[PDB]
Design a binder for this molecule. Sequence first.
Ligand SMILES: [Mg+2]
Ligand SMILES: [Mg+2]
Ligand SMILES: [Zn+2]
Lengths: 148, 152, 287, 304, 108, 57, 155
Amino acid sequence: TARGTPSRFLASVLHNGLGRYVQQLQRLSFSVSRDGASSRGAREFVEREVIDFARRNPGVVIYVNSRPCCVPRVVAEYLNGAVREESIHCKSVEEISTLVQKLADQSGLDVIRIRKPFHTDNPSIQGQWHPFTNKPTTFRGLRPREVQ
Amino acid sequence: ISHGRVFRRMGLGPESRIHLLRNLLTGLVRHERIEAPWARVDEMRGYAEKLIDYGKLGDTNERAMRMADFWLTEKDLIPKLFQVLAPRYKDQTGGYTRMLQIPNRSLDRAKMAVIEYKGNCLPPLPLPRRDSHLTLLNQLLQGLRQDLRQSQ
Amino acid sequence: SPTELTEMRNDLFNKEKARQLSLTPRTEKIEVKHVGKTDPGTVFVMNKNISTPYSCAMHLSEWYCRKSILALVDGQPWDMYKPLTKSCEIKFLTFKDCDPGEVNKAYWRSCAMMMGCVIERAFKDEYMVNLVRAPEVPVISGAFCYDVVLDSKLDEWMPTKENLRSFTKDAHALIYKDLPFETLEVEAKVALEIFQHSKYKVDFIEEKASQNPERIVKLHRIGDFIDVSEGPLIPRTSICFQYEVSAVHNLQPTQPSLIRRFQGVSLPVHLRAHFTIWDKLLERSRK
Amino acid sequence: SGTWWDEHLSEENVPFIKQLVSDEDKAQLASKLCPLKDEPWPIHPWEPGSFRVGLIALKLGMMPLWTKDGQKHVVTLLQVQDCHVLKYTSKENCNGKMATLSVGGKTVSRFRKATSILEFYRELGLPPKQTVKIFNITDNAAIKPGTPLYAAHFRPGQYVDVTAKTIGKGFQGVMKRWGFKGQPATHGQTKTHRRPGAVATGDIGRVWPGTKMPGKMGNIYRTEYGLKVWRINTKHNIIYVNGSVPGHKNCLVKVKDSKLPAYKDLGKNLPFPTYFPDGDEEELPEDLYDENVCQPGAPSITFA
Amino acid sequence: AAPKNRRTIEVNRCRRRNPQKLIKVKNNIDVCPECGHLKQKHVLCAYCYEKVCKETAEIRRQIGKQEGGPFKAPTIETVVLYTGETPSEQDQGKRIIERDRKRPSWFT
Amino acid sequence: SGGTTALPLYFVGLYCDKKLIAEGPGETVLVAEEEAARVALRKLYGFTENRRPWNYS
Amino acid sequence: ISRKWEKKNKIVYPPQLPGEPRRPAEIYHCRRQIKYSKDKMWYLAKLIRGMSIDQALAQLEFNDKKGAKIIKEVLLEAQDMAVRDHNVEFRSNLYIAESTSGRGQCLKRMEKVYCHYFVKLVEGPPPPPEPPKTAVAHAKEYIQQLRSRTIVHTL
Ligand SMILES: [Mg+2]
Ligand SMILES: [Mg+2]
Ligand SMILES: [Zn+2]
């Protein structure tokens, strides 16, 4: 629920698309058990999908190890320091590919209510409204019901 | 409404009130100092004063003798009243008893009070003195004593 | 340029204070026996030249610290903040003892020093104020006096009541600030080798110790202020609660200069005096 | 912190301070007895539609007093003690109503008051009063603060209104407080003898505000109107007001001219601004009497 | 009648911790300036009063031991004398209640 | 607007020989003058709010 | 049954550097199974909440409630332990940092109530009370709130 949940404003890491786009995900750790039944989709992903993903994303360092011994997991680390874990136990190779792409396609901010859908740093060009725009002025700057 | 009623209400009625105060007064005449609940002592102080007043008239008077017969229960004390207390206060015309408040009672946390007949033999109660005459405020007031006396 | 004269005093004051405090050879111990009817027969074990009588008072109870106003060691008054020096005997003097003589004297000379630290900065910098002395007067007199000399340009200026009100407000600011009365034992040469600005207290400085066999003198410091007095002072300026400088006097033999004299009267927080009694006391602080 | 005046004084100092402050009080009281040798204010002749200050008296007790027509008339004794006009506030200082005077009564100790009140009275040169009351007067009735007021301020033959704090009965049930016919005795009225009946009707689920119910009684200010003045004792400053007056004995009451719309006139023959004993106009005797009082020392009445 | 609803901890806290129900800090305690014990102003030093009651009880025990039994209120004054105190010139003809400890400093 | 209250608004405008060169808001007239100086400085130094945004392409 | 309070007198901090401010010492102490309700002991516990030890003892010596002497004995034992073991210098240089009363165990007949009393004494002088909110502070915070308004629900 909104009231019962944090929130943030719409933002980017380092003005990402301004100069040059940079890919925020920088490290991806796969733990895949060589024997466990829950590590089957993970084993398929590593055997026939991780090389292609590594080639398509050369800014991400992908480590894979075989010592959880019962449960797999993927831990994604980002430029801005954020970590994000996702379960891949008992999932299909399609699901794991979709998930890993999702991880590589987002900035490491928090997935919480974005208050505004548009963030602008220079919201005004003609000058933000104040009660004296569109209001006349009178001779010598007199207030109403003055004399001098 | 209780406007202008000077007598406390205690005991099981008026009579028990007189009897309670009578026992307190007898204890006071026998020992010359007793610790009792504060309100009861404050009620008994007037009676002890007037008892000394009646005792000054002396044995020969019969009204005083009847009164001291009622208000003293162990009669060995009636001699004392007429031969040790009343003679002792031949000078004072009032205020024969001093009444203080003391630490509340341990059990029922009642307001206590020690009451005694002035001049007895007992070790003296720790009365509270006033501030020494040599304290700063008193010294300034003494200077004002002098300076006002000379002017007048 | 008085605003640098204060610094020129305080820097050397702190210098001597530090050089004295650094003479202690690795925290030696002294024994202070306590005498008096209250809590008698205790033996404090203190530090030879760090612990003060307060360091002893706090050992006993907050009551002793709150009520104590001066300390007898070897049966002579000894300020509360002044460090001890040797295995001694101690007792604490308050305002409500039977004989508050020494305490009253200390209180009134402390009030004199406070009035000094108030008057000196009271005037416009273009004038030149020079503190003469704190003439010791008995408490019975009716007010404490402080002799100062104003610059000759003010002969036609007898202070008006409003300016006395300003003096009182400033003194109340000083007490409200709650500064302590630090003390310092110093060889008499500071007054003869540095303090050239001593023009009228140049007389007092020999009165410090020329009379006594030793060649050491006492300095008292409120804080960014220094002055000598003839005895111990009360520990904090908060002790005073009611305070007022009433009027001023002049001494007729006006050959050297106009020796203005300032009168004031005060009481501690303990011995507060009711409003009307205080008015009566003030009326007599004008003699 | 917390303390009273003579807590720290020594044994031989309390009597002196008592004597000194009492002497100063007497001196200050005496140094205001002549308000015309000081600087008075304009004394205008009375004209219709004006109002003049009143007094703060102290209720002594009651007595009878008969009349030449043969009837009886209880009266109440009001002693004017130290009644001084204390303050003045201007017509538009109260923002339109009238001019006002603050009058005080019944000198009190000075060790038992707040600092502000002591400052006020010190600047005014008087010892503190007990009750201060505000009288609404016209502009021309002004009196300089510091002047005294005296029982001769009134004269017999007029009517006068008196306001005071009634006697406090404490918390009272409903029949002692509002005259409620409680419920009968036996015939079985168990546990209901002196009780209110139905507090309110049934359809409304509330008790109206202003319903008569148990609670504190008396001890509120209230006014009696139309009391006539029979006698004045100008040596002890007593006023003999007809009928009974609220309050208990030795409690301060506020006396002023009758405001009822049948005595609006007859403020003329009264001394308008006040009575000044220093006017020296055929100095008043010890007792001023109404035209119809069988005063003592006179022959016993006869009806022929 | 009976309650219609439980009362919450909030209402109960606004009642129980209201100032009117709190224990007031006492502004009238101080220290016996000579004896140095705590006391209220209008009340006797508790320690001093106890040390007085002890001596009163000892004196009264001696009085009882001398009077024998009940119903023996003497018809003369009484004076109490501690060790090494001969009956003064004013106390002849007054019963003496001897005690066997040095007179207390506070006994005048 | 609101000259006497505790929440005033003063709009102070600098001029240079009968021609405006800035305009600033504030609560005190001193602060409004300071802000008018700041906006005039920005206009002269070419650093306004609506300047030609930097050209990253 | 949890004995946590008396275990906070065993946290051994690291030896201080000669630079950092001297750390104020502490002592935690508790009385268990006080035959007294908790809703009554709470008033005494709150009375002495923010005052030094000596003033607390003074205030308790002259209070009427039964738990006053229990709190007093607890505070005296705490002071003695603080000086004797926790290397406090001046036995008057302590103040009641935390005072609270808690429920107890024993059985019924009608509950037979019990309660514990928990006190934390912190070395040093009492901290001054929070001063009243002066009118200038109220105006300052109202201005702060008026000066943080943004245009709501737009760019
Ligand atoms: Mg009863
Ligand atoms: Mg019945
Ligand atoms: Zn004592």
